[PDB]
Structures are given as C-alpha cells and as structure tokens.
Amino acid sequence: SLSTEATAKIVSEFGRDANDTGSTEVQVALLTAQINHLQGHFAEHKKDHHSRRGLLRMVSQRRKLLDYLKRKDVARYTQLIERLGLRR
Amino acid sequence: MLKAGVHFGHQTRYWNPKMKPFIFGARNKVHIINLEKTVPMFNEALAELNKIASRKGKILFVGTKRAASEAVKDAALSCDQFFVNHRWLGGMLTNWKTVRQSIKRLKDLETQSQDGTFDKLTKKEALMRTRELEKLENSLGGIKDMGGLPDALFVIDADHEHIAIKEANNLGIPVFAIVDTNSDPDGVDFVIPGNDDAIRAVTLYLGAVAATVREGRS
Amino acid sequence: SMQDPIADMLTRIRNGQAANKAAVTMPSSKLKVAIANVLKEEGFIEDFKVEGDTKPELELTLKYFQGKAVVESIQRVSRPGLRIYKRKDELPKVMAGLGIAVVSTSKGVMTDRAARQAGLGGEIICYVA
RNA sequence: CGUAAAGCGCACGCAGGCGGUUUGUUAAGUCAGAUGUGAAAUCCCCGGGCUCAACCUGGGAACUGCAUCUGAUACUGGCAAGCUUGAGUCUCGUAGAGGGGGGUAGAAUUCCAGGUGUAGCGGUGAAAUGCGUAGAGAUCUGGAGGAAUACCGGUGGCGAAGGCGGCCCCCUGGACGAAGACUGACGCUCAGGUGCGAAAGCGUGGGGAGCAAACAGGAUUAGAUACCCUGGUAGUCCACGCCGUAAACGAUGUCGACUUGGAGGUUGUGCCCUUGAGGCGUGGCUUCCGGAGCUAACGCGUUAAGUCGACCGCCUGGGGAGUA
Ligand SMILES: [Mg+2]
Ligand SMILES: [Mg+2]
Ligand SMILES: [Mg+2]
Ligand SMILES: [Mg+2]
Ligand SMILES: [Mg+2]
Ligand SMILES: [Mg+2]
Ligand SMILES: [Mg+2]
Ligand SMILES: [Mg+2]
Ligand SMILES: [Mg+2]
Ligand SMILES: [Mg+2]
Ligand SMILES: [Mg+2]
Ligand SMILES: [Mg+2]
Ligand SMILES: [Mg+2]
Ligand SMILES: [Mg+2]
Ligand SMILES: [Mg+2]
Ligand SMILES: [Mg+2]
Ligand SMILES: [Mg+2]
Ligand SMILES: [Mg+2]
Ligand SMILES: [Mg+2]
Ligand SMILES: [Mg+2]
Ligand SMILES: [Mg+2]
Ligand SMILES: [Mg+2]
C-alpha cells in the first residue's frame, strides 16, 4: 500500500515517537497520505471500481476517526486538520 | 477384578461423544476405557444382579455376534438362566404373546422327534418339517421355558443389540449392557464400559455374571 | 456487537443447561455478579466465583436435580431495545410464585418477593423457573 | 418471512435506534411516600327504600392520569477520570482467474494467393436446399484478420455482490498468519441518500474470424410463422455514456455471543525431531455426512433453518395486478 519509509516518516512527524503508531493523529495522517497518493491512480484508472471501494473505506475510516478526535478534544482536532489541510 | 485386556477400544473415528466421560485417553489412535471407572460400575452391577437373583428373578443374555454366540450358550449351561445366541427377532418382548405360539410349535415339533412319531416313509413328514426344529431352536432355543417376560436384561453389545434395548425400555425391564466406546448409552439403566467383541473380554463378563446369579439364587 | 451482556449471561446458562455442562464461564461484571448472587440464594446455581483482576471471568457452577436441568426456563425480560419498569403492585410472579423474577430496585438487585416485601419497584431483569 | 404471501441484487453511509468494562458525580428516566387535582352520574363493593325486580339512593373503592414537594441510587441516561477483552494502526511474511492499463505467445476456425490432384463434397432418421468439371472436397506452402485461452483445472482459489482462467510488465484493493508495540469504545445497524450491479437492449465512433435473433430457402407435418438442414443481418468484440433488470438463488438480511461430533479440500503457523512422500498442536476459508434441538413436513444441524441480543427490510386468501 504505502512505502515503509513513507509510513515511518509520518509516524515520527505526527506521533509522540517512532513507536507511537496507534495515535489517532498517526492513523489519520497515514490515511490522508494514502488518499492523496491514490488521487493520481484513479485519475488515469477511472474504471478501477474494485480498488476504488478500498479507497472509500479509507475515506470513511478517516471521517470516523476525525469525529472521535473532535469529541475527545476539540483543540487538538483543530490543529490536526490545519496541518493536513483537509475538511474543506 | 481389574486385569489385562478389556481396556482396548475401537478407532477414534467411530467413538460416540456420549461416552466421553468413560474414556481414559486415545492410545495409538484407539480409545482405551477407564478401568478405574469400570470396576465401581461393574462390581455394583453384579451386586444388583445378585439382589435380583435372590428374588428368584429371571435373567436373559443377549449375544448375537459370532465372536460370542457360543459363549452365551455356555453360560446358559453353567447357570439355569436364559439367553439369545443368534439374531434377535424384532419384538421378542413387545409381542411375546405372539411369540408364545411359536414356542408351542417348537414343543410339539420337539415332542414328535422324541417318541419317533416323525419316522414315516414320506420325505415331507421326515425331512421338511424336522428342519423347522433346527431353524426354531437356533432362535428360540434358550427362551423355550422362560414362560414370560424377563426380570432383567444382560446385553454384550449396546449398539449391535439396540433392538433388544428398545424393547426392555418400552416394557421397563432393567437393562444391563456392556456399552463400548462407539456404543450408545442412555438406553441402558446400568452402564458397564469395556470391550464388546474381544473373546477374552466377553468370556470374562458372562463368566463373571454366571457366578453371581448362582450365588444369589442359592 | 455484544449490546446486552445480561442476555449473554442468561443465554450461556440456558445453553449450558441444555448441554449438561458442569459449569459455564464468561466475562465478569458487577451487574452479572449481583444476578449470579440472587440465583445462588434461590438455589438455581450451586456456586459462583470470579477469577482474575484486569479481565475478571465469572464462573457459575450449574446444578442438576435427578439428572435434569434445575433451570427449567430462563428468559430476558428488559432489553436495550425495550426496557420494562414495574411499580410495587405491578411486580410479576413467575409460575404463580413458584419461579422468581430478578428485579433491580434502588436497594440493589433482588428477587420479586424480596422487592415486594421491601415495597420497592424497578427494572425487571428476567424470569427464572 | 429456505420451499405455503413475505429478506432490498450487493454494498458504503447521514438522521435514528442500540452499545464492552471500572471509579466518582448528577438524580433526567426509573422507584418509594406525601400534597393538590382527576365534577356529578355511570361501572364496581358493602348497605338502604319502592310487596320482589328493573329502578331510586347512603358510604366507600375506583378514576390505572397530570403537577408539585421530600427521599432512594440498583439499572438506563448526562458529566469527569479510567481500563483493555470490541474496533483500529504499525513491524515481518504467505496464497490467490481481486481490479485497471499495456505488451506478447501458441493451437485452431474462416478468408486470400499458389502447387499437387479428380468427381464428388456437405448434411440428415432419410432427403433436399447448398457447394463442385469456371476444378470443389481432400492435401501442401505463404499471407491477412478477429475472437477465445486446450492440457493444468480440482463441490479448487479470489471478490461486497454481479463476477473473475494463456504468459509477461506497470499501477492498485482486500484477506490471513507470527510474536511484539501502540490508540483506548473510536462500536453495531441503517429509512432517506449515494455507489456498484450478469445477459439482453440503447447512443456515438471503430471492429467483425466464429457463432447467431430477425430473415430466406430446403425438409418434417393434416398445417409447422417451430423442433432438424443449408445460408445469414443485428448482436456478440473495443472506447465512452446510458439502461438498473435476472430462478441478481444458499429461493435463507447484517453484526455479536453461546451450544455433542466424524471425514476431506485449501492456505498460514508452533513443536518433536534421523530413523519423512513421520508425530502431536494452533489460526483463516471451504465441501460432505450427521447428534441434541428445531421444523407442517421436506429438511437445517458450530458456515443453524438450534439457544439469545441489536437494527433494518418485507408479508396479511386466490384472481384482477406488480396491472391502471
Ligand atoms: Mg491497511
Ligand atoms: Mg411458488
Ligand atoms: Mg414464496
Ligand atoms: Mg452496513
Ligand atoms: Mg453500559
Ligand atoms: Mg428523578
Ligand atoms: Mg367521578
Ligand atoms: Mg330490599
Ligand atoms: Mg351509589
Ligand atoms: Mg453512569
Ligand atoms: Mg437508502
Ligand atoms: Mg452486453
Ligand atoms: Mg452497441
Ligand atoms: Mg456498432
Ligand atoms: Mg439455423
Ligand atoms: Mg427483482
Ligand atoms: Mg445457486
Ligand atoms: Mg429474493
Ligand atoms: Mg440476498
Ligand atoms: Mg446435516
Ligand atoms: Mg408497471
Ligand atoms: Mg417485470
């Protein structure tokens, strides 16, 4: 799916350390990176419906995590969306 | 008492889950019966059989497999109890009144041979009907003088003789059976786990039972 | 998803009784222990115990009388989809009082007879016969 | 609600419904008591009076409700802090016709050109139409083009369903296993809605070998607008868009827990290891037979149509009619 080097970079950037992978920010950041990457894939492969279904799951999963984070702590949620530049 | 043999069972493929409590383990792919559990049940069974014997009760042995067909007959000679050595006719107890006339026919057939009134020139009178003697006694030989339903049942195989078990349950006669790993329990009021086909195992059972009835009968 | 753990507790007992199992085990909770305690006093279950601290497991020692299940019939009454509350005078009696109904009152979980004597209503948990 | 009427073709999901476990707190729901109110009559209970009754009438109960006040805190809800078993992320691997794009290979049908060669070929129950002395069929050589991937191949595999088989490359989704770490209820279901959805069909532009609706002829038959035969167009193929229906079937909605067994297939993994085309374990998926139980019966049976929980869909005699 995503390269290990790219995955490791995001975890350190958004997580507490290189070992904090379960954080809601790392999870959202990982999903956001994949969705952005797949934009080029579906730009050319418009008919790849089977792979698109997988993409929609990432979109749905990200929204579920985002809403949970907003409920838990609004201030931290606001920073996360600002850094990733989503929710437009 | 506990001794060699008997512990052996059948293949684990054909085991009956209902008998899980009485299996000690799976040795060499064949279940082996828990003798330490068999003895308390086996020993108590003879105690009850002795108690029924003390009441002048009638015990009936049920053995159909050829590995024990002759064995049950020998017990019927050591003690004066009844037995079945061949196929169990469907309904030997549920409709014993129907089977009564069959017994009477055997008595009349038996009588004719004794005094020689069957010695006639015609082959029909001499050969065709006398063969009914062999056919009848091989199935009703041990039940000729029962004169009624039995007060207890002894069965060497709880699945191969499931017809016999059903009749006893319907009539309420207590059932004592050697129920094997693959056999079906819950149809017998007394459970005696162990082998049901080994020659050295079967002979021990009826040989053991044949003694207690004699002691109880006195 | 498991949305009503109580019916899981009742279902396990019913399934365990049908299968003639000696005992049944499941995740433990304060509410489950309270119901388990009530059953123990009434004599429906022989004994109960709780093992573990971080993930405690509740263990119920089922009992049988004359080779048949003691719990003839157990069924959930109040459910998350439809919850049942009864007043002091509306407390039901199972099998004309032969059975018991577990009711959670302000003073704790107790049988309907105890709640009626104490003059308190509350949620009706289940009927046990 | 498998087969009698009844599970959307399948999914993702807002509103809604419901929600693991621990402590504290709130006391809304809930529960206890009291107060006010709930007209009288009527119903009901115990009495009274018309000679009895109907009828009349005293008292009580009832009016299951609503509102307040005072308490209770088990349960549900709100709030705060938690927790790891639900769910999810990360690390290392494995299998697979999962999807999209491109390239390529072999067998073969048809067609075209040529060589050899001569009277049949083809087809059927029989026959004819048809093809052939303008040289067919057969046979060899060369070329052109289209479509599908023999053997492997398997109640085998993958996918939400529909569905997906030569080989190679690029892009890409999901599942599963091993231990370890991390987040700490972030979950389940889903009206409306949105997406996907065999084949046929439609629009535009290509392609078109084979097959083949329609159509034509020859047979069959009392007739044959059929079955059979010789031909043959759309279509079947590609790009894009539309259509949104199937016996879209397991005639069985999704999620979770629980409940005797036996024999296989397939794909990970641990352990014993010299007495290996071995021995004992632990996961995922899957086929068959069967116990209790269930079912009108047939049958289902740990992949339930058994025992339960959450939510949604749908049914209410047949026809008229899934029609106006
Ligand atoms: Mg992933
Ligand atoms: Mg029908
Ligand atoms: Mg139907
Ligand atoms: Mg869904
Ligand atoms: Mg809760
Ligand atoms: Mg309140
Ligand atoms: Mg009134
Ligand atoms: Mg009067
Ligand atoms: Mg009155
Ligand atoms: Mg609370
Ligand atoms: Mg909708
Ligand atoms: Mg089509
Ligand atoms: Mg077209
Ligand atoms: Mg066209
Ligand atoms: Mg044709
Ligand atoms: Mg339909
Ligand atoms: Mg089918
Ligand atoms: Mg349907
Ligand atoms: Mg369906
Ligand atoms: Mg079956
Ligand atoms: Mg219509
Ligand atoms: Mg239609």
DSSP symbols for C31-86: HHHHHHHHHHHHTSEEEEEEE-SSS-EEEEEE-EETTEES---EEE-SBTTB--EE
List the end-to-end C-alpha distance of chain C, in Å, as a whole number.
29
- C51 and C87 part of one domain: no
| CB C117 within 7 Å, strand D | no
Residue A30 CB in 7 A reach of strand D: yes
* CB half-sphere exposure, C12, CA atoms < 13 A: 20
Burial pattern C56-86, b for ≥16 Cβ within 10 A else e, equals: eebbbebbeeeeebbbeebebbbeeeeeeeb
Solving technique: cryo-EM
Using CA atoms, how far apart are residues A34 and A40, in angstroms rounded to an integer? 11
Number of domains in chain C: 2
In angstroms, the CA C94 to CA C75 distance is: 11
Question: Is the shortest CB-to-strand distance from C89 to strand D under 7 Å?
Answer: yes
Whether nucleic acid strand D comes within 7 Å of the CB of A56, the answer is: yes
CA-to-C1' span, B173 to D254 (A): 54
Are the C-beta atoms of A74 and A44 separated by less than 8 Å? no
- Pick from C38, C69, C100: which residue ends a domain? C69
Kindly state whether residues C62 and C31 are assigned to the same domain: yes
How many helices and strands (H and E) does chain A possess? 4, 0
Nucleotide closest in space to A10 (CA vs C1'): D90
Angle in degrees, 0-180, between the axes of helices A24-44 and A49-72, rounded to the nearest 10: 150
Ligand 9 centroid–CA C89 distance in Å is 27
Co-location of C58 and C86 in the same domain: no
Q: What are B21-28's contacts with CB under 8 Å, separation 24+?
A: B22/B181, B22/B191, B22/B193, B23/B181
Residues C62 and C86 placed together within one structural domain of the fold: no
C13 and C58 in one domain? yes
Residues C85 and C38 in one domain: no
Rounded to whole angstroms, how far apart are CA atoms C116 and C1?
A: 35
Considering every ligand atom shown, identify the ligand nearest to the alpha carbon of residue A2 and give its number.
1
CB-strand contact C10/D, under 7 Å: yes
Kindly state whether residues C89 and C50 are assigned to the same domain: no
Indicate which CATH number applies to the domain containing C113.
Answer: 3.30.1490.10
Helix H or strand E segment including C111: strand C108-111
- The token duo for B23 is 């299996």
In Å, what is the separation between the CA of A40 and the C1' of D205? 28
How many other CB atoms sit within 10 Å of the CB of residue B12? Answer: 15
* Complete edge-to-edge strand list for the sheet that includes strand B190-191: B82-84, B59-62, B152-155, B175-177, B190-191
- For residue B113, what are its two tokens? 């041979």
Show the tokens assigned to B148. 């009624």
Q: Verify that C65 and C83 share a domain, yes or no.
A: no
Domain encompassing residue C14: 5-69
C44-50: which pairs have CB atoms within 8 A and are 24 or more residues apart? Answer: C44/C70, C44/C71, C44/C128, C45/C13, C45/C70, C45/C71
Which nucleotides of strand D are protein-proximal, with an atom < 7 A from a CB?
A: 11-14, 17-23, 29-33, 71-76, 83-86, 88-92, 98-101, 159-162, 171-174, 181-183, 185-188, 195-197, 240-241, 255-263, 280, 292-293, 306-311
Alpha carbon distance A84, B106 (integer Å): 102
For residue B191, what are the CA distances in angstroms to A56, B144, B155, B158, C8? Answer: 63, 28, 10, 10, 36
- Half-sphere exposure for B183 (CA within 13 Å, toward CB): 28
Are the CB atoms for C94 and C100 separated by under 8 Å? yes
CA-to-C1' span, A19 to D181 (A):
7
Which two structure tokens, joined as six digits, stand for C125? 């948990």
Residues 8-67 in B having a C-beta less than 7 A from any atom of strand D are: 12-13, 15, 17-18, 20, 29
| Whether C114 CB is under 7 Å from strand D | no
Q: Which nucleotide is nearest to C33 (CA to C1')?
A: D74
Q: What's the CA C3/C1' D255 distance, rounded, in angstroms?
A: 10
CB A1 within 8 A of CB A10: no
Q: Please list the residues that pair with C126 across neighbouring strands.
A: C76, C102
Using the CB atom, is residue C31 less than 7 Å from strand D?
Answer: yes
Partners of C69 in the β-ladder: C64
Number of neighbouring beta carbons within 10 Å of residue B184: 16
Helix, coil or strand: residue B68: coil
> CB of C59 within 8 A of CB of C50?
yes
Q: Which two tokens stand for residue B69?
A: 């067909």
What radius of gyration, in Å, describes the C-alpha atoms of chain A? 14
Rounded distance, CA C8 to CA B153, Å?
A: 45
* Distance between Cα C87 and ligand 10 center (Å): 23
Using an 8 Å Cβ cutoff, are B39 and B45 in contact? no
Q: At how many Å resolution was this determined? A: 2.3
C88 touches strand D (CB under 7 A): yes
* Strand blocks (E) in chain B: 8-11, 23-27, 30-33, 59-62, 82-84, 152-155, 175-177, 190-191
Tokens of B175: 């059932």
Closest nt by CA–C1' to C109: D74
Which nt is closest to the CA of C55, judged by C1'? D85
Q: Which chains have 3+ CB pairs within 8 A of A?
A: none
